[PDB]
Design a protein around this ligand. Structure first.
Ligand SMILES: [Cu+2]
Ligand SMILES: [Cu+2]
Ligand SMILES: [Zn+2]
Ligand SMILES: [Zn+2]
Lengths: 153, 153
């Protein structure tokens, strides 16, 4: 199964995030190309609950969290399903990369098809900050771009 | 269950299409508000197969047609799952309305969550035309706007 999200916004950030998953129990491969970010930085990157684009990136809602866990790093076992950590940006503001994830799925009752991807303006502190906010959002800040995740082939 | 598609493009047409379905066997209520169309007209309106926005409205693919039927009117038994007929536009170019449909679902293996809605620049001939093309697209013409269908609440 394949899916894709086209990230758009008004802040100069835009990109494309691709998903592929062979079967429900197998990892999903997530790959991304994102332009217009701050250079030489780390930027929070998550699946949010709703595929709702009626109000910018606000209407995407919170991090996708069906299991009611705190916010964490992708390699933490306690994390939101949608937590994809930080993406690294180069000297030109480009984030490009890929990873595998075993919580993110395109199949079954936690499928992210129809949800959203958000790229943030700040760094995700991976749930390790001082704040109650760290356990909710990682303090990753504003949502310069987002896109609904759709089926493709 | 609720879903929504935000229709966008570069042709002056834009809008929002909402979906609600209580359970898989019951009708889906589809409501829409679309601006910027030709006035006093009828414009084709369909669910297309893919929620892929990487190439304008082209990458949405063809009408959603899992049962491999010909294109028809919503009230035809032989139609594509995605066939929503024409929407009527007023003297200001606005289409606003709602309807129930029993093939379109937000639940189950034919769910349209993660697919696309397209509003066309021309009238859908409902499969009644003189063409092979009528039985594929209803001759509804260009795709001035589209949006991926996402989960909301
Ligand atoms: Cu986020
Ligand atoms: Cu169409
Ligand atoms: Zn999170
Ligand atoms: Zn059709």
């Amino acid at each position: 199964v394949q899916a894709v999200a086209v990230l758009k916004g008004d802040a100069g950030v835009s990109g494309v995030v691709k998903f592929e998953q062979a079967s429900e129990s197998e990892p999903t491969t997530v790959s991304y190309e994102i332009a217009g970010n701050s250079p030489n930085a780390e930027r929070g990157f998550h699946i949010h609950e709703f595929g709702d684009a009626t109000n910018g990136c606000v209407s995407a809602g919170p991090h996708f969290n069906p299991f009611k866990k705190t916010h964490g790093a992708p390699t933490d076992e306690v994390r939101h399903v949608g937590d994809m950590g930080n993406v690294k940006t180069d000297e030109n503001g480009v984030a490009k990369g890929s990873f595998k994830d075993s919580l993110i799925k395109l199949i079954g009752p936690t499928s992210v098809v129809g949800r959203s991807v958000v790229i943030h303006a700040g760094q995700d502190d991976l749930g390790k900050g001082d704040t109650e906010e760290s356990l909710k959002t990682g303090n990753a800040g504003p949502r310069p771009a987002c896109g609904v995740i759709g089926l493709t082939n």
